[PDB]
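assembly run, all chains below
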Amino acid sequence: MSGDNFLKAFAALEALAALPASAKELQLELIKQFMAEAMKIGNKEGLLLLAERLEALKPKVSPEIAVLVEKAAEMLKLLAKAL
Amino acid sequence: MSGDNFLKAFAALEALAALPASAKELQLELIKQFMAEAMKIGNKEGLLLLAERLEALKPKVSPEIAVLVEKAAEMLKLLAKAL
Amino acid sequence: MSGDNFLKAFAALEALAALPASAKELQLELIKQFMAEAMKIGNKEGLLLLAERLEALKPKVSPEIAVLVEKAAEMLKLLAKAL
Amino acid sequence: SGDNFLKAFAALEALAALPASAKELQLELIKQFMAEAMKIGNKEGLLLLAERLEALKPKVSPEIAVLVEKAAEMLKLLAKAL
Amino acid sequence: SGDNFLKAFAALEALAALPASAKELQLELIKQFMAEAMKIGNKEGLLLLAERLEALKPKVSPEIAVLVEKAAEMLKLLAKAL
Amino acid sequence: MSGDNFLKAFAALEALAALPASAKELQLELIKQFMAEAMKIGNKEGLLLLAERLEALKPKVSPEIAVLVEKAAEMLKLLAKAL
Amino acid sequence: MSGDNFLKAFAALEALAALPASAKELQLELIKQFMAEAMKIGNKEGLLLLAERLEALKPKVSPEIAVLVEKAAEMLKLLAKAL
Amino acid sequence: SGDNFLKAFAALEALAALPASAKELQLELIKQFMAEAMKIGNKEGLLLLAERLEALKPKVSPEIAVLVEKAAEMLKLLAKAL
Amino acid sequence: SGDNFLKAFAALEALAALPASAKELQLELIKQFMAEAMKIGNKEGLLLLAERLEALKPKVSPEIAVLVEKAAEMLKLLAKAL
Amino acid sequence: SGDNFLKAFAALEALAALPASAKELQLELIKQFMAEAMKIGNKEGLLLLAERLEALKPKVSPEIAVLVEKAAEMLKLLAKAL
Amino acid sequence: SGDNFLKAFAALEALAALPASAKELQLELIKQFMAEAMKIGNKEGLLLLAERLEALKPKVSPEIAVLVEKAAEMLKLLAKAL
Amino acid sequence: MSGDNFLKAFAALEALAALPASAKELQLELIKQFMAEAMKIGNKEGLLLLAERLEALKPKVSPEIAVLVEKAAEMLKLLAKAL
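ok done. output:
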């Protein structure tokens, strides 16, 4: 398993949670960090757990970023199915 | 900004292009590698260029990962609009 | 005096505490990640802090993993005593 | 920016969970935090971490408290210079 | 495993553009390709690279062609072992 | 499955075997190195093999580290049984 | 690691050849990625191969860079002669 | 951790050779310097780099000199906390 | 050159200590050995490892024994190409 | 990138301290200098190093002087392009 | 510290298995050994590795034999300086 | 040919020269850093240049490190002689 990638992806969501909704540029950067780490996870449950946690942060982000949060969670779910 | 990430991501699409449509497992791993590298690209044009090249690969991938390719391209395009 | 190993180990316990009890597989993987980082810590108070924080997560993990949580924390205290 | 902001943010959360008596480890986490916050290059995140760093000054040892105050002041100065 | 397939596939495309007289550079790209191909845990990727490697036998030096042949036979044996 | 971690961990036991029983800090440091590499082994036989080799070295380690060696080998076994 | 540098330099030219002539920013970044890898090549045939391939890409690059491509291929030739 | 002392020393030498008008480049080297100096455990090194950082204050841009001043006092307090 | 000989030599020592039944672990160590032995530009070292690898052939699984022999033959061909 | 300016600046400092006869080492430090100077995204950094690189040309070997020259011209065109 | 002792110990193990004729590889492993032995910081580890290095002097070339004796002498001097 | 190790070794002697003769623990650390890099140089001119430079630092270092500085310079000259 790529547990280190799950650790870094989980920590990206924790810092993304504590950012104000106005810091759109830092939110966008952490999602790029989160996705890059999540795309290396070979565990289905890990991808789905991060997908449901990412969806929980969608109310905590800018509306422009919320669309990314949705499409990113959709990718992790599709990546879990394809594994 | 991150041209080395653009190099690895572009090389991922070229190796993906040479894969047979039945090598679903290997195609899926290069997509995970491509998205991991493309997530670190801060140039809007480079993301859109790679997104278009990824969409041209949809007919050559396995039909069970073609949706993932389609969403990965939309993932990159939405990234370019957000940067 | 590591410091950075304490950060990765502490982050591993935070990700471990957020997992459901049914994800023994991610729990086992994060423990292996946590132990790999906790083993590189040359600070006695840090080893005891992580060991205590690890013992608190025993009720929230699967009973098959709980014996690993017990031995992991027990070893961190032995390592702290050896320093 | 993003990768440095993660480890710096994670350094503050581990620092908050330390007891006020583990001074040697508290000092080491701020050295790890300042080494990572010094590579961010963003104004808003530097001010976000500097504000979070100030909130941990009561939870820190009295000797480290002046280090925490001076570290948060420099992240503000670093943010203004950018 | 995928990143090893990337560098191994890129080494073959670079080896393909090399002239037959660049024997020193052909040997080094094969050392590079093998070093990466030995970390591929995918049976299909090894069989593909091995077949691509054998298509390069006429374009490489005759001294290298034996190395090309033995390297392809290794990838098949590694593939069958998986 | 990462044989690279098995190589470092196996090399740690060989250097640990060549140390005198008095080199307490050298033994303790090699064991912290051994465990950090052993926790990243995802093979059942590799963990059980190194755990068996670790118990064979307990007569050669310092009395202070003997209990740590004892629990380190028990950790690797409890690992492989959960893998 | 002479051969690894040649791999990344050759991959840099192939990605540069696939870029549109308007992507001056990407073409620039790839040139710097190419030269950074080309400076680490100690093979005379390798430098002359990449220098002639880089010359072939000069009409395909943004006009602002065609001068920079010319001096880069010039530099790689002067390196091969000095080796 | 003398490896970090080497880079932090090299950062001050590059900072000393910059023109006073290279504000952005000065700011980057100080960000690099503090990232390396924050990993130093030796007391004499933190004080030597702090006294060398203060000697460069007349050579930096007038914005950044305050940041240089606080970065030096930061290294003074770290050496004290050790 | 030397650091790859160290890892390759260390791989054979760990491979020789493996039981004949640990097929998956034997295969991974040869994947590790060959990856390191494929960046050794020393003729004496390649022949040393090739002879040392041939002696491990009775110790390994029958299917790995074929991979062991093909591996020794590659290093000899590498040594002759250098 | 500030880290690349630091390594490139250190390359020029060592290059300036070499004797005029050390052709092989002067050539190697230039390859090291350029490999780091290529990854610099600051105009003032590239022109600063190109200025210092031109000041080293009288002290290097005549064969190396042609590379020192074209490397300074590269960094100027590089700063113009950014 | 412990990882440096590991590679240094592994360097002596591979050095002991080398024939007295592979001088370029014996020389390279010694430079690999000293590169790792310089960053150990443990007085016992330096003296133990210096002893094992001395015991390899009969199995190495007379040219490398003087490198072996001076490398062991320095590890002994380094252990006293700690 | 590792000119990078020459850069790190040259920078080590510059920082060593700027140290006072009293910070023995820091001077000794830079000797260890310098030696670790100087071993992997491989250039006969560079080893003799750093050896001659290192000799010029021997009167400036602490009296205990001077015997180590002397033997360190004799090693680099023996390395360049064996090259």
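Residues 2-81 of chain J form one domain.

Chain J has one domain: 2-81.

not gonna interpret more than that til we talk
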